[PDB]
Amino acid sequence: HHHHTDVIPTEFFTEPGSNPHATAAEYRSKCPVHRINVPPGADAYAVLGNKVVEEALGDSRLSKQVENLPARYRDKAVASSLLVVGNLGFADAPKHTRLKKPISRAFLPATVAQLRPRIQDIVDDLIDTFPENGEIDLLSSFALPMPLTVICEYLGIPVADRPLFLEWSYILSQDPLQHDEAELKAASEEFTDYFTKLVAERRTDLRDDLLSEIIRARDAGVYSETELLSTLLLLIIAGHKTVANMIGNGTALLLRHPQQLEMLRATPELIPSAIEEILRYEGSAAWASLRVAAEDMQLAGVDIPKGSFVHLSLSSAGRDPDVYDDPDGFDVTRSPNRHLSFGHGPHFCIGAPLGRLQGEIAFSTLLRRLPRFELAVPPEEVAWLSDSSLSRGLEALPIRVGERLPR
Numbered sequence: 001h002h003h004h005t006d007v008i009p010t011e012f013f014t015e016p017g018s019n020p021h022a023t024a025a026e027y028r029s030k031c032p033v034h035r036i037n038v039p040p041g042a043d044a045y046a047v048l049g050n051k052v053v054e055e056a057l058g059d060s061r062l063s064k065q066v067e068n069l070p071a072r073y074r075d076k077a078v079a080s081s082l083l084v085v086g087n088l089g090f091a092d093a094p095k096h097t098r099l100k101k102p103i104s105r106a107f108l109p110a111t112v113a114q115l116r117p118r119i120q121d122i123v124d125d126l127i128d129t130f131p132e133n134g135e136i137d138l139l140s141s142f143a144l145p146m147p148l149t150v151i152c153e154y155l156g157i158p159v160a161d162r163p164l165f166l167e168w169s170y171i172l173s174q175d176p177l178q179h180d181e182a183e184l185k186a187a188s189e190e191f192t193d194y195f196t197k198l199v200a201e202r203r204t205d206l207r208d209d210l211l212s213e214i215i216r217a218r219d220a221g222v223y224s225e226t227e228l229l230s231t232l233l234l235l236i237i238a239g240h241k242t243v244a245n246m247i248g249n250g251t252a253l254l255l256r257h258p259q260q261l262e263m264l265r266a267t268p269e270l271i272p273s274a275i276e277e278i279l280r281y282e283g284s285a286a287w288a289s290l291r292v293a294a295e296d297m298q299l300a301g302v303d304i305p306k307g308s309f310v311h312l313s314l315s316s317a318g319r320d321p322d323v324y325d326d327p328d329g330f331d332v333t334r335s336p337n338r339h340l341s342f343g344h345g346p347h348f349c350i351g352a353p354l355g356r357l358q359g360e361i362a363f364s365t366l367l368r369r370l371p372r373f374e375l376a377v378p379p380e381e382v383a384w385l386s387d388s389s390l391s392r393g394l395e396a397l398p399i400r401v402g403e404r405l406p407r
């Protein structure tokens with residue numbers, strides 16, 4: 001027996017590949033917690049075991065506040081990214097409760113459930129734009145614009161400014177410690193200027209939306225200007241990137257498992273179950289967001305010094321054989337199917353009801369209206385996107401639409 005000091009390469013995070021699951025399993029079988037080179041040169045750990053991910057997700061010794069980063073990382077993150085500085089996503093107790101309170105009611109299940117008719121119209125309006133018996137990229141035609149439209153209408157942001165939101169979201173979702181600095185600063189400043197002007201307009205006649213609730217909190221001193229702007233940015237990013245990748249990953253997985261797609265066609269009621277299995281197997285967030293040791297700490301026997309990054313692999317947690325029978329089998333009937341793909345504890349996804357509802361309406365409507373859509377390319381041509389973001393998602397999903405039935 002000899003002690004081993006190997007550090008998981010950066011690429012395990014930034015450039016995983018088509019099947020990174022075997023690699024994660026090999027690391028996980030040896031230990032739940034490992035040194036990882038993310039960002040490059042940093043003291044950082046990856047957590048791969050389901051149960052230890054679950055503990056870490058809720059462990060208050062891990063801070064989400066950017067001021068708890070070592071100075072060289074803190075200074076770089078703050079100068080670049082409006083995302084990391086002032087929202088509930090990057091807040092510990094008690095700031096987390098203050099930053100969460102103005103928006104939490106808007107995301108309750110029974111409230112979100114009233115968006116069903118408008119979501120259905122958005123989905124139908126998008127499918128109406130498909131070329132019948134043509135070819136689409138499902139991401140650009142549907143998976144991106146559907147949830148962007150939903151969160152835009154729900155905030156009371158003009159749908160017309162779609163491509164600005166798509167670009168700002170993609171750039172500002174990237175890790176400011178790994179991604180081009182100039183790009184993120186420009187995105188931060190362009191987002192700031194747009195929303196400064198929109199808020200000033202919306203203030204002069206508050207409308208009864210979420211943006212009006214957010215403006216009210218700002219005007220009452222519950223949010224600073226930065227916290228209003230950072231909060232809007234999280235809601236926009238987390239609002240559409242995750243749902244986009246759920247529809248993209250999910251459609252690819254169903255086409256890769258055609259008998260289970262036929263099952264969903266025959267019995268549409270199974271679609272919520274299929275959504276949960278999509279989230280376990282290829283969850284839109286492969287990693288939980290920024291966490292740093294606030295103090296010297298031990299997690300599952302490994303000593304993590306103060307200031308170390310701790311990266312939680314939701315992807316690895318989804319395939320843990322301690323939790324799931326046949327973890328690498330995709331089975332839409334898996335039940336119950338408890339997973340960590342929406343996180344756990346105080347930062348549990350506020351969007352989960354809204355994401356689950358959009359998933360059900362999206363897949364129900366695609367399967368009903370396009371009775372036989374298929375891949376437009378050989379499956380080996382379907383590429384997973386590599387970037388510094390928390391995402392697990394496709395570059396593109398070429399689809400032959402086939403016949404298109406009316407809404």
Ligand code: HEM
Nearest residue numbers: 088089235238239242284285288289342343347349351355
């Ligand atoms: C399938 C869809 C989605 C997935 C897979 C997903 C995943 C997550 C995950 C893993 C976290 C926890 C991050 C952590 O602990 O570091 C989370 C938090 C959050 N997500 Fe979602 N998300 C979903 C859709 C949404 C939607 C539609 C919204 C709309 C605004 C949303 C807004 C939130 C926000 C605001 C947080 C931070 C909550 C907090 O820190 O207290 N998400 N999401």
Ligand SMILES: CS[C@H](Cc1c[nH]c2ccccc12)C(=O)O
Nearest residue numbers: 089173241242285289389390391
């Ligand atoms: C949907 S995955 C991710 C965006 C995201 C989801 N939840 C978060 C909490 C904090 C910070 C960022 C995120 C992406 O980049 O695709």
